[PDB]
Structure 1
Amino acid sequence: SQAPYLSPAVPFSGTIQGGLQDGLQITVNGTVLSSSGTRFAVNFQTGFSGNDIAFHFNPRFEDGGYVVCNTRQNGSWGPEERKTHMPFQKGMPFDLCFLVQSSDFKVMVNGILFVQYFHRVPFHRVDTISVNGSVQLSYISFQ
């Protein structure tokens, strides 16, 4: 029920005005760049530190393309999960939707379930979404 971020410049760090509460659905619509950059990441975190990211979703256009999901606590990366699926094209706007559940995040890419990720830390300590890399952001919205 929070008014969306329209065309946010991309290194971006903005507030989830009440934190992640269960049921919440968050769309990130953007478009991957053809710059030399070969990664971007959408991070759900505690604050603007970026030292503790409950859920780091990091698509990479290297090694053939693969997305890495992980969780940062006090500046130290837990074990990754990887899909080798890569749901994005350079040059095409994705509708990327994170749905918040009791046990997990369900990440839909263009309304098809891409990965589901199980919370390692609790989710209602998360107050900030940040995005960086070779992506341009049309919008981030809250539902």
Structure 2
Amino acid sequence: QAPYLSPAVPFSGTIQGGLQDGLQITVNGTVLSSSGTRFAVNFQTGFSGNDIAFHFNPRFEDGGYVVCNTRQNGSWGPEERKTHMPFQKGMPFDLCFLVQSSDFKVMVNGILFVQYFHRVPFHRVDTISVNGSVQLSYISFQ
């Protein structure tokens, strides 16, 4: 799949073939300095946002933490919070998601940050969305 270059936020975009085991999705961009305190990358089924298999949600709030969660039929599940903030307001980042059989692995700036065990079947994910306090340079697929 060809990369999305400079896509405007809020973005959604199709993932050709959907998520498969071993797929790596790179989101390269910049956290805005003064344009809010949260952003999210969502791996979801379709364009509606009611079914998000993996919501990855850094929050520059309450000391800095990242929320990982799943939305199913419009309902959010129990949050998994990583109380580390690997991003910095105003700074560029490279975020890479590795789809594995049991979990997503998430690397930030070349370092494994968190894993998230699948709560719903990943093959059903065919869409990536990004919203919030970020500007995107590219989203690429291998």
**In 1: Cα distance, 2:15 partner to 2:34 partner:** 29
CA deviation string 1:58-108 (max 9, x = no partner): 000011110000000000001000011100011211000000000000000
Matched, 1:94 2:72: no
Runs of 4 or more off by more than 2 Å in structure 1?
none
**In 1: Cα distance, 2:48 partner to 2:9 partner:** 17
2:32–2:91 CA contact under 8 A, matched in 1: no
In structure 1, the partner of 2:55 is: 56
2:96–2:106 CA contact under 8 A, matched in 1: yes
Aligned-CA RMSD value? 0.6
In structure 1, the partner of 2:14 is: 15
**In 2: Cα distance, 1:68 partner to 1:26 partner:** 19
- Residue 123 of structure 1: how far off its partner (Å): 0.3
Matched, 1:103 2:102: yes
**In 2: Cα distance, 1:89 partner to 1:68 partner:** 16
Query: Across the two proteins, how many residue pairs are aligned to each other?
Result: 142
2:34–2:89 CA contact under 8 A, matched in 1: no
Helix, strand or coil: the match of 1:42? Answer: strand
Identity %: 100
